[PDB]
């Protein structure tokens, strides 16, 4: 008699739910992780919960989730992320905890194909560190020159040993916080990760 | 800070171990006589006709 | 007639080998799997190559009858004309999976931003009105010739034919080796350079079955436009026209297992479901 | 607050065209459903069209279809051509939002009066007029032709209260549940075709005419409009 | 005097056991051993609701046994009806984290929250048509795992901050709180009659609250792994739990132990909801293994498998009246089996 109308209005609701999922499948959404006071406040900002921050670099939609508030264990909710495009990873060169979080993050069940850009920020304040103190007191194995750049490389070493699977990439990119590329970079590599993923639902890769 | 923790740890374990306990059998009992008494009244494990089923 | 005992077993093993991919191909994607964009374009590829299952036992029966149509003119106008638009369609969607490929690897930003179930489902409906527009001129021109009443062909040949040959081979071949050739050199470079040899053995082999499965119908189509039936070599050309025939139908038992049965999910998915 | 005000009503002169408009406001104007309903100065309530949420789905009475329209800036619209001297009533609006548990009718507008100078189920209301004094028991009852009484177990009968000089209110809506705000002595109980309207602890308040309307399909009727009165 | 207090401790507790062990004459399944098994259960697939885009989290159903409620991580909470299939609101969310969502008995409140930090109250009934936030609940500074209304005024959360709280919707202030456990509170039942409620945290214990005093009845520890969904008995004299150790167990309250353990060999993975039937004979658990085990709560026996979920049952529950059960999953898809 009246359930017509109801029907109509369930259409009608369905049909609002169907343009509000294709417009949200249009974000990028990246997962940003790494330890406490890494850079991960400075990145970004330079472009209580949960905190989500949105922008738009060269026509896509870029969002930004913001776990670190969370002081409860990781295993109950991590796989609420499990969709994200890519996981942005900060370290703090001028500073292990980082070392076993990437390690835990990198072959979690839930992140198997999901790739990582890995941030190795303070780049300056890292090498005026190596300038006063030496890089074996982190690294007790660390047998070679003590100049910045081969430290540096040791350290990215250090991370991309923590990767076993080979359906997945890790974009290292060294920055000083005193820049802007940061959104490039991470353009680039989102782009790189979309074709992949895109190759993949295509059966090609 | 720890001595405070101790002593609201060691006062609910009093607390607890202060509850009269029944027999176990008492208990399978009551829930075994629960089940059975509404067990015709339950439509889960004994499938209703079509006639009196909202989503047949 | 070694060639006619040669299109019957043909037709009959891509019968036998088409009907099973292809129902599992459809029930699995249309029913077990929800709608994305990459599942639009197989559940068409499979509609039409199953429609083409459904046709060749008519097929099968044009040649038992051995050029005799004791049926109707509707007949003869209609069954020709739903086989040629499955085909036809099914060559088009084809192509629509190169472009969609190579649109997905070249722009990736805006398939971010504008590919999605819906247009998808746009360009499906324009191939298929394609397709009808071109089994148009089948259905139009097909007629019966009374010693025994035949199905046949009554210059406007040579438009059909022609128009046949470059818009259903010539667009679609270039369009999909230039698509993958892309794609393989794009695999040249960045993470993509472990997988170039896997990528590069997929998009030969799909490119070589459709290549082997569709020309012989088009240099035959040509021979036959080139020679006349009376002259010598013509019978050959008819007799071996069933065969080719038969070969781009064998396209449609061969399609299911070279795309859909690449995706890891849709292997998972029709290996849990039988 | 929900309001509805109406506008366009005058001095018309026969076989003419007058547009009506009934601007909402202090809710969700596009999620409701709109209906416009007529009453004329001697007569009740009368159904004349509904246009949906959504626009989809309009629907006019038979006296009505191809002479009026209805559309719907959070207003909506009666545009009325070639008008009869039939023709001249108070016009109502009402919001009529539709989905399972949800009260339908549930506002009207204040009015705009307007002067020019077959198988439908029928709504019948025997008594017309009935004397009543406060805080004694009255019972008002109505019978439909067709059952109201539907498949999914909803009867769809619907009572309105239209004190004198202000606009219907609805009571009780699908025969049996209390619409929000109206006090707890009004009772409705039927079984399918024969409906009754309870009243217990009558007040000043409750002093109008009544009407019973049926939603089971359209087009919507009222009955003839029972009047209770002081002393 | 710390190394006194921790003697002290570890005797209670030692008491406690003993206490326990003293009460355990004899065993459930020794009890109904001598009834008969119910069978075979069979139940098909009567609704499958498609509206969710993303991974269901929650669902609830109303006391009206055809209305529920759904919460999805793409951002929307989904009045159903049931029979019908028809989609009665559809409630965009500020936070699209959401973990958990209640719908209030009385018909007029629904509640949401998750990784924000917040439990909302979305009111049904208001008088200007639309769905509106009638409250937002902010005292937690742990995500909110799960919510369950007392009436439409109260609320009980449990939280990821390891601590449960009674609000007061028109205030909008934390009425009181349950505290004692050291995991994060991952699920949450209240009894029949309302004036006490279980929790199951993440140190693979289940506490015994009461909503008047907000003090600890009785702890229950039996299982190894974080418990993950828990459910009161019919006669409110009993609960089962789901655990990620791959087991469902039942606890007396007045036994104050387990009473039966539910598992088999070839079952890994961690239970995600728990529910029971309308007389409490079965016990129906969803499952990380894609399916839900329906068990005989008497006899420990598994008695039907609900198939036909591709993705993580994430919730399930039973209609008041028992006529249905519904199961939400991963998939982006709520099904009706009966
Ligand atoms: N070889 C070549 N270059 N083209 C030649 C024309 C091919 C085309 N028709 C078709 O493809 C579709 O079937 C054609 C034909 C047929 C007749 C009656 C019933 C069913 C099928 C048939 C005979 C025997 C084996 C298979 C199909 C066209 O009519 O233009």
Known sequence: AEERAALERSKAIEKNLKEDGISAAKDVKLLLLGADNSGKSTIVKQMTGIVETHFTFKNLHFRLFDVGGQRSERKKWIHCFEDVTAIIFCVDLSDHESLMLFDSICNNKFFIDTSIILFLNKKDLFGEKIKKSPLTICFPEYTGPNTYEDAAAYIQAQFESKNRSPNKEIYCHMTCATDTNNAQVIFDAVTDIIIANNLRGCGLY | ASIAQARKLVEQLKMEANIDRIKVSKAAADLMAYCEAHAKEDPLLTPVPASENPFR | EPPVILSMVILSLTFLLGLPGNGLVLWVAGLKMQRTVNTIWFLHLTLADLLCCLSLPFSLAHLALQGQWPYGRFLCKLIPSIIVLNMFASVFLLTAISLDRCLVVFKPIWCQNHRNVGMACSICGCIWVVAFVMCIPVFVYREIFTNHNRCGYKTPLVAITITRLVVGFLLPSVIMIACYSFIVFRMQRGRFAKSQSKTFRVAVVVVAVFLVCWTPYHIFGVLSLLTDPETPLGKTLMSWDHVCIALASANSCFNPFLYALLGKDFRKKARQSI | ?231 | ELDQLRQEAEQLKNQIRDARKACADATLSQITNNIDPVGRIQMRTRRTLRGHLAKIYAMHWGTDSRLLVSASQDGKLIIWDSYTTNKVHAIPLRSSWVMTCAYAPSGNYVACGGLDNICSIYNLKTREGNVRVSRELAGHTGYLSCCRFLDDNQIVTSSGDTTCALWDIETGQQTTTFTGHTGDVMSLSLAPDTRLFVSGACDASAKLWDVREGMCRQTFTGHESDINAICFFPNGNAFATGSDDATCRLFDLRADQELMTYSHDNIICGITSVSFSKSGRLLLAGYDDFNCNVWDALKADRAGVLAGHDNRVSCLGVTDDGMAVATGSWDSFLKIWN
């Open chain 4, 1 to 231: 607050d929900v309001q509805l005000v109406e506008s366009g009503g005058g001095l018309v002169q026969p076989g003419g065209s007058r547009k009506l408009s009934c601007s909402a406001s202090g809710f969700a104007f596009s999620s409701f459903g709109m209906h416009w309903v007529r009453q004329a100065p001697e007569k009740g309530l009368e159904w004349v069209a509904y246009i949906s949420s959504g626009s989809g789905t309009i629907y006019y009475a038979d006296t009505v279809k191809g002479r009026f329209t209805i559309s719907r800036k959070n207003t909506l619209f009666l545009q009325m051509t070639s008008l009869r001297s039939e023709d001249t009533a108070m016009y109502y609006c009402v919001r009529s939002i539709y989905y399972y548990g949800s009260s339908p009718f549930d506002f009207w507008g204040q009015g705009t009066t307007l002067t020019v100078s077959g198988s439908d189920i029928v709504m019948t209301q025997a008594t017309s007029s009935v004397p009543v004094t406060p805080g004694e028991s009255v019972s008002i009852s109505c019978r439909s032709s067709k059952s109201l009484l539907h498949s999914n177990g909803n009867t769809y009968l619907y009572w309105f209260l239209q004190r004198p000089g202000q606009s219907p209110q609805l009571l009780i809506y699908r025969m049996s549940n209390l619409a929000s705000g109206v006090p707890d002595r009004f009772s409705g109980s039927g079984s399918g075709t024969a409906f009754t309207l309870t009243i217990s602890r009558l007040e000043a308040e409750d002093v109008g005419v009544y009407y019973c309307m049926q939603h089971l399909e359209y087009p919507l009727t009222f009955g003839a409009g029972t009047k209770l009165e002081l002393k």
